[PDB]
Each structure stands twice: as structure tokens, then as C-alpha cells.
């Protein structure tokens, strides 16, 4: 199952090509740059033209309370998944759970991730492992993450991974190896034709 | 100095409240569910009415390249500091850094905070002591924090402190103690007069 990161900063552009390439992805994930463009309401107007779900990438890190009136107003937006960071507390996650399914960070793919994040990963699966959440993220890039994650995860939560790279194997490889969601970004929505391009992932996953 | 926490989220009328206010604060911090009512505009506005400089407290924690085009964003629509979170590693930070002023989390106030954050709370003051950012925040529930993060931070980074008691001598209290700005929320934005209070409380710390 393909997550498509939606991250065209231009609201018509952005609902265009995810019409188009609905056939072959399980949901949208919209950040904070496209919310800040064209408005939190973007995710109702793509909800309401494609009726696929939708991921807000928010990685929000506030205070309790904050969380909780950022995730009233996405969810009510029309979100169906908010992606929440573990490292400021289960008080943090928890007000974010309360109003719509979550998504938690466990361990980050740029350089800096080393420096905090990354070494309490192990720690952060086993909060993960309490609360429960539909899922977590596995940087993709180098698949033995994936497979350290899921060794690691309870049953029952998901991995979404990001970063696969673009080797004929290498979707496939990050599905068996314990991805149930590969997240894809301009390898799809900067193709000359979108739907195409993610219907070569998909098919190569269900092959 | 008071920095107004302007929690109000219908945009014209935290407007309204912010100009009746603005000359008793340095700065009008403002957060994501007021960016989200009334789009980021908000603060362009905010800054054209009142004269008082932005903070756009974001707590900004994703990789370098979003948190650079959130930052280029905010920055852009006449934000004057964004707040970051120091956990997500120096280059995330540096990223916002590179194109505006920041405001570093080295410590917050929650429960939840002594899970991860607080325990790391003495080695991101380290991390902000070589980034040199404009300021930090200094959670004055506990007012000797306040003290405790000064003597550890870096002369020349200034310190933001919120959650100080509304009993009388504890704002001028913190101010003495190492804090530079005081952020102030509900006992000016839910106050009868809010001008009034914001004069109350400046008069205390002065």
C-alpha cells in the first residue's frame, strides 16, 4: 500500500494529481508547508474530491492542551491520521489520540536524528508498544531499520516507511522485510504521468 | 518585558486585544491554532497593527527541509523569531536559524516532559550555548529554573520564561533572577480590561 506524500504547493495542482493517481494508493499525506499555503481546508477539499484518507504529517511536539486544539482542528478538517512526536510525553501523545487515530515518531531519518532521537529509539518503540497507536515510522532508506523496528513493535501497530530506494526490488523488499505502507513522494507526483509511475510501485509490491 | 502569549484564536479579535495592549509588551507570541483559524496572515497583520514584534511559537521538530519551509514561510509573512525544539538534532535547528531569528526548547513543564525531555534538559543547553540563538525558554513554574538555566546558558542568549505565579514580586522576582522577557497569557487575554492588566504587570516588574 502506497502513502503518497502530496507535497505540490499548489492546492489545484496538489487535488489534481490526487485524483488521478487514487486507483493506486491507500492514502495522502499533507504537511505543514501545504496546510500553511493553502489552508488547513485543503484537507477537506481533498477529502471531499477523493475520498482517500489522509495523513496530517504534523509531527507535533506541544504541550498537551496545544496538541489537542491542533488536532481538533485537523481531524476536523478532515484528517483521518496525525502523525505525533513520542519524545515529548504520552500526556502529549495521549491528547492527540483522544480525538482521531495517531501515527508516532520513533526514529528519524536526517543526520541530526543521531544526536537525540535515534538513540532513544528503543525507548520510544516501547511507548509506542503502551499506547498503541495505527502505526509508526521505519526511515526506509536502509531497510534493516524496518526489520530492527518490527522485531521490536507490538503486533497489531503498522510501519509506514519512507525513503525506498529506487532499485527494482527494493518497494517489494521494504513490504516483506515488515512495511505495510511505503510512503512516496516526486517519484510519483513529479512523474510525467503520476498515475503511471504509482502503478509501477503497486505493481510491484502485489508481484 | 512582557511578551503577550496571545491565545485567542478568532483572529480579529485577538487582533483587537493585541492593539488595546500592545504598548505594555516587547512581543506577541503566537501558536498554531491561531495560525490555522485565521491563516498565517495573521501575523502580518499583528505586526502592522500593533508595531510589536512576532514570535511564532511553532516548536518546530521535523527534518532540515520542512522545518526550512515552514521556517521560510512564517519568516516571510512577518514573523521576527520562530521557536524550535532542540531535540530533532543542530541541523534541524540550523535550518530555521539560516533565515531568521530563533528561540530554542531546552525544558518544558508538563508531566510528560520529565519522560525524555528534562532529562536532556543540561545537554541542549549545551547544544543552544554553540548555536547562539537569539534566546531560550525557561519554564518558570519553578521559578529557580529560571536561575538554574542563566547560569548555564551562554551570556548573550536571552531567556523567555512563562508559568510565573501571579502572586506579587515573582514576575520582578524572575526578571532579577535571569529572565529578560516574561510570557504572559490569560491574566491579560481573559482579563476584564486587558490593557489595564498588561499595565498592572508591567508596573510589577518594573
Avoid at 499533507?30 to 481546508?41: A, E, Q, R, Y
Wanted: hydrophobic residues 45%.
Amino acid at each position: 500500500m502506497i502513502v503518497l506524500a502530496l507535497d505540490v504547493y499548489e492546492g489545484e495542482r496538489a487535488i489534481k494529481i490526487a485524483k488521478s493517481v487514487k486507483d493506486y494508493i491507500s492514502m495522502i499525506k499533507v504537511n505543514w508547508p501545504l496546510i500553511l499555503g493553502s489552508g488547513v481546508d485543503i484537507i477537506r477539499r481533498l477529502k471531499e474530491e477523493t475520498g482517500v484518507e489522509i495523513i496530517a504529517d504534523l509531527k507535533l511536539a506541544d504541550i498537551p492542551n496545544t496538541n489537542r486544539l491542533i488536532a481538533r482542528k485537523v481531524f476536523g478538517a478532515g484528517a483521518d491520521y496525525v502523525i505525533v512526536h513520542t519524545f515529548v510525553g504520552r500526556d502529549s501523545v495521549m491528547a492527540v489520540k483522544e480525538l482521531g487515530e495517531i501515527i508516532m515518531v520513533v526514529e528519524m531519518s536526517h543526520p541530526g536524528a543521531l544526536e537525540f532521537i535515534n538513540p532513544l529509539t528503543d525507548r520510544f518503540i516501547e511507548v509506542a508498544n503502551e499506547i498503541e497507536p495505527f502505526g509508526v515510522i521505519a526511515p526506509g532508506t536502509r531497510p534493516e531499520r524496518i526489520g530492527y523496528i518490527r522485531d521490536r513493535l507490538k503486533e497489531g501497530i503498522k510501519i509506514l516507511a519512507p525513503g525506498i530506494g529506487a532499485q527494482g526490488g527494493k518497494a517489494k523488499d521494504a513490504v516483506k522485510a515488515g512495511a505495510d505502507y511505503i510512503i512516496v513522494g516526486r517519484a510519483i507526483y513529479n512523474a510525467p504521468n503520476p498515475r503511471e509511475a504509482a502503478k509501477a510501485i503497486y505493481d510491484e509490491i502485489r508481484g
